[PDB]
Amino acid sequence: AASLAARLDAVFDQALRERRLVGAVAIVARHGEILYRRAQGLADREAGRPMREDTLFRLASVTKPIVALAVLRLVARGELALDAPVTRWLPEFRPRLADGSEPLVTIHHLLTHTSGLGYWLLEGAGSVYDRLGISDGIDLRDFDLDENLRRLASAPLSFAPGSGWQYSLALDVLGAVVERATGQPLAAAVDALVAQPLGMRDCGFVSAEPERFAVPYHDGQPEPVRMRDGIEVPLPEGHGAAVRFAPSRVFEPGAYPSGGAGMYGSADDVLRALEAIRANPGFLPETLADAARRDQAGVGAETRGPGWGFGYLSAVLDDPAAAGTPQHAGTLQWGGVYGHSWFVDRALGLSVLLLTNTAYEGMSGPLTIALRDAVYA
Amino acid sequence: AASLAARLDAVFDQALRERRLVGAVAIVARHGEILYRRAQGLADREAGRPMREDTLFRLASVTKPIVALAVLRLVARGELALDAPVTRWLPEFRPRLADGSEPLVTIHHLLTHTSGLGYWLLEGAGSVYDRLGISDGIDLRDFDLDENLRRLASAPLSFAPGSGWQYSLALDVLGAVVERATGQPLAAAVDALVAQPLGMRDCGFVSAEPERFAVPYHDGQPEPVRMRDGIEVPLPEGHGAAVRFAPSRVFEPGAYPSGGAGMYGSADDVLRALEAIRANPGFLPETLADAARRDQAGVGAETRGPGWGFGYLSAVLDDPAAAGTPQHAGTLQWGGVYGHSWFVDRALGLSVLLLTNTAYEGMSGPLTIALRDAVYA
């Protein structure tokens, strides 16, 4: 713990002084043992308010593993089935292929991002999704989940279900499925199916306590810029066009629940979900848990470049040398566009979590490689 | 801050190493700015559950400043008056002196602990209070508050109201007064008068969530020992006889609300109350707030030893030199038998709070002195 902590603080120190990072919370656990848990920098720069260990964060796509857990809990109960048509819960969600014909789309297709659906951020302004007014769930729009999914369903699939991999709005679709299966709003279903059983008390989809939050920033000069609603921040090289951010979304009760991007939570609560995934203390049936953590897409998918497939929850490390990383094979990893990154190195019993208020440094920037390297040095 | 954090952490590190402390949460604020907010050690040693900044604690006499604020909000509202007889709300509460006379007992006498009332703990086994079966509010008994106050009123007062100082069940009497004055149970009344206006979201009288709590231990060698209901633990020299602990009391709905010992809360919520006392942003009328923080008893009362009197909320430091402390005159201070200590050094704008699960080290032990000294180093 002592040497690791020195390496990590060195990383963070440099990052803060070089104005690459406003503030972060990072946790390292090994076989359920906390080796590092620290707040870094500021939560609200303008107010001079320091980051705290239990500061709340908008999770963006760190939401996906939590909502995927909810879907799997319903599968374990027999209320969903991996091979069932999505139309059993969403009768009008019938996207068509480019030739006009309608394929079968299963719950499995959606969890693995192999259904053919996409995201606005893939190509941005003037794209199909753009013309159709489809929301990625990070911006604030005046319509509900049903209306976004109607719009989504009117777009052509990128390929036939099961024949490709593409990151997508599938978890926003699965959010609606969960609501229909449970007969509850998505916030309540997630609470019942995942957060309460795991002891996650500080997470949800809408908050009324802005003073507890990490204020979002995006990369800039000569210092990170404080986000305001409506802004379009371009994605790096090989990560997509852009993202349209609304920091106020988390506080608006009329923001539809986005299963792919819409939750908030503390670092401790996210760690509780990652640990349940890592260690499966009777949270899911053993065969279903193993399937969810196994690559279900293929290395050909290159979901975060070469050597990575995809399971039901995240990318899955297939080839460490091809991916250029010290992580061991079997590692689980994903992130979030507000500036977060996490991985579970299953062989080492390692859960590593980084939540930040700086998009995109904490998602894909040098910060993330430097911290990962520090953990394995 | 970085400096203060290192000095404070070294004190905790040694306390933990020597096994004089299982776990704690401490906070130092200066003129409204959080300088230090840290969890240390374990909440539940046997389960290996670490302390968290939001861990809940049984507050013991840290209840008193919060219930006293409830009383003072009623006074400001005109529903109580400092000068009024307790009998205007508790007609049958008529303690007598050792001659037979029924003296005047006012709200002022209770708030200051100058009424003549006492505690079982002052004498313990075999005493008058023992013979009458009077409870200090920390153990679990099969009767309600009205029954405990009937027993209490049957004991003779120790001295004439206003003629001396003696730590007492007076805040438990005042809890009953608040119930009569508001027509609500004490928990609901405190919630309305104090916790809601001050944003104290994680406090109360009865909890259904044991997994959130710090488990109570008592001092011991080689290590502190986990308490069970009904055990008796002698108090430190010059502190009284003993305390009978019932850790399950906070989870039992049938436990009467004790205004002097009965609440639970988090460190943050306690800090909100202490800050309200310290800076009074329109929470109470200025003259009443000043009266409450002013010595109403005199240095002679030696309430924390020589140099200390008492106001309406706590001890008040009159003479630092006599008290052998670096704290400034005017300092407010009190504690709790589950292992807690707090003070407000008004001159320095300082609020300092220690909540622990180790009776009595976190209340009166070397730990409290070493922490105090590091703050002022």
Ligand SMILES: *P(=O)(OC(C)C)OC(C)C
């Ligand atoms: P998420 O935060 O994406 C949202 C914009 C839906 O994940 C990143 C890796 C694209």
Ligand SMILES: *P(=O)(OC(C)C)OC(C)C
């Ligand atoms: P409180 O926690 O105690 C009575 C309820 C017995 O503490 C005082 C003695 C400071």
